[PDB]
Symmetry: D2
Subunit: 145 residues, 4 copies
């Protein structure tokens, strides 16, 4: 019977992304699929070179919070029958970085995304990351709400 | 342990939609969910009352063809372990009708869609019916490519 | 001191598109630009070859109605200081045809569009033809509402 | 009929500056008021302990946006455009631009670049433009 083999679940810090992760674990268990959770630290903030260290302080703190969240997720997955969890934090423009991750790891056959994220839940029904990735992903994409 | 209960798969006459239907059957099998396939006959063409019978002839043929496709899908589904298939042909503006179907049958907890359809596979990676439904659906949506 | 030289105003049969045309003539007058109004007859309806005559009867009537609206538009432009009006009725998928038209005539340096059209004013603030054209046009695009 | 009040939201990109330049061209022809708006995006993830770090960053970005505004004020003085209001706000850009137009309902044109700082090698129209075209109460023109 036909199955997903390699799932990607991009997550920001939002409850909607965490609900997408939870469903991605459920999908991974059902299909006995590999699972990768990816947080992108957005590094595109305008700055002159003089402000490099202030930007690093901000992003490295964001990265550390994201790593603490991934550690809790690894513990959670160990209580399920999903076979594994790889966790990854990378820096870049989130939507581009998600697209490139999928395209440059072509074994990935599903992306699981929250409908919304940290910025726009009381303004749109679907955020611009989700919309972009739906558009540009080389594989199936499921939007969780 | 959450599972889908009632899956809606909107189909046009395209191969992309038929691939979406095949996956919806796989999801319905794995979840033992109810499945409904829905073809919308687009009835919005410009016409004066004098041309009603001409348009009616064209739309009635399209409907009949869609019903032929549906009969074949019922036969397919009987070769699988999916519980059932409800088949529906509706007249309306496709993206609005899909949205309304999901909102008006709120037990629907997944919509399955092809990325593209009959019109633009050669111009876009995601068609405007998909993009509309991803935005406006009250439930999870999965885009199949 | 740049000016437009060759403006395209795609119209459907909606009031919103006619308000677009009205503004296109205003822009045309100001820049002393050439103006082209383009109505696309959507010929993408599902039909087998036995049905071509039924479809053609529908499309020819739509085309004839469009031609009468163009006649009225030529009359209106002659009451203004806008240099001219070319009118065109084409057959194809509307958003594709508009894109192709602007690429076929690269002199075109503005496309003027209504925000919405005949199908979706009660569902969206901007229609799918307009968003497609904003995305895909090789030149500036103004949206009229 | 003519435009009375034009808003031209700008980021720091060349695209946006081309948008600004056309906005001046439109403003002169119509003898419309012109406002240029730069929104400092303040949505970065951060805990309270990091408030002052983010403040430092955003305040520098704001300051650069002001140097751009000053150079634009000087350009507009060379033209017969009636005026330039310059403004710098803090918030989510696309939301802020929408709010600005609905909170100043005299605005009858928004002029935008097709793309901006982040995505010209990925999309033909950016997400800020997309959102404003959709949510604006008035005409919107996309410059490319
Ligand atoms: N930085 C990121 N890293 C990884 N995944 C992300 C990131 N940002 C968003 N996502 C994924 O995309 C989903 C939707 O977030 P998105 O950014 O589209 O919404 P939003 O922030 O509410 O709106 P917008 O950013 O368009 O204002 C999230 O639930 C998450 O799954
Ligand atoms: N008339 C319809 N009835 C039911 N579902 C449809 C209909 N039209 C499209 N869909 C669904 O949406 C999916 C994508 O089709 P969509 O219409 O968005 O693409 P397209 O025809 O290529 O592009 P567009 O119509 O934007 O030019 C289809 O695979 C199908 O699942
Ligand atoms: N067939 C056409 N020929 C020329 N221009 C068109 C055509 N259809 C739409 N347009 C142009 O696009 C503008 C917006 O129409 P659009 O089709 O996007 O909106 P809609 O019909 O309300 O929504 P949708 O088709 O997405 O449901 C119109 O005001 C017109 O300028
Ligand atoms: N922070 C801002 N303040 C004011 N105007 C802006 C801002 N950001 C973008 N704009 C306006 O929107 C136009 C398009 O920028 P947009 O942000 O949509 O493109 P992008 O940065 O290339 O893509 P994206 O942000 O979707 O990755 C700009 O040229 C500018 O006119
Ligand atoms: Ca976001
Ligand atoms: Ca379609
Ligand atoms: Ca339309
Ligand atoms: Ca941007």
């Amino acid at each position: 019977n036909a199955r997903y083999t390699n799932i990607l679940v991009p997550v920001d810090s939002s409850d909607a992304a965490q609900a997408a992760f939870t469903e991605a674990v459920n999908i991974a268990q059902r299909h006995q699929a590999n699972l990768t959770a990816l947080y992108v630290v957005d590094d595109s903030a305008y700055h002159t070179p003089a402000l490099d260290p202030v930007l690093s302080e901000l992003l490295d703190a964001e990265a550390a919070h994201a790593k603490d969240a991934m550690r809790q997720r690894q513990q959670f997955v160990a209580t399920t029958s999903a076979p594994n969890l790889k966790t990854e934090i990378s820096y870049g423009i989130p939507k581009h970085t998600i697209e490139d991750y999928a395209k440059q790891h072509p074994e990935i056959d599903l992306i699981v995304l929250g409908a919304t994220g940290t910025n726009s839940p009381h303004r749109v029904a679907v955020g611009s990351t989700t919309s972009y990735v739906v558009d540009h992903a080389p594989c199936n994409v499921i939007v969780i709400r």
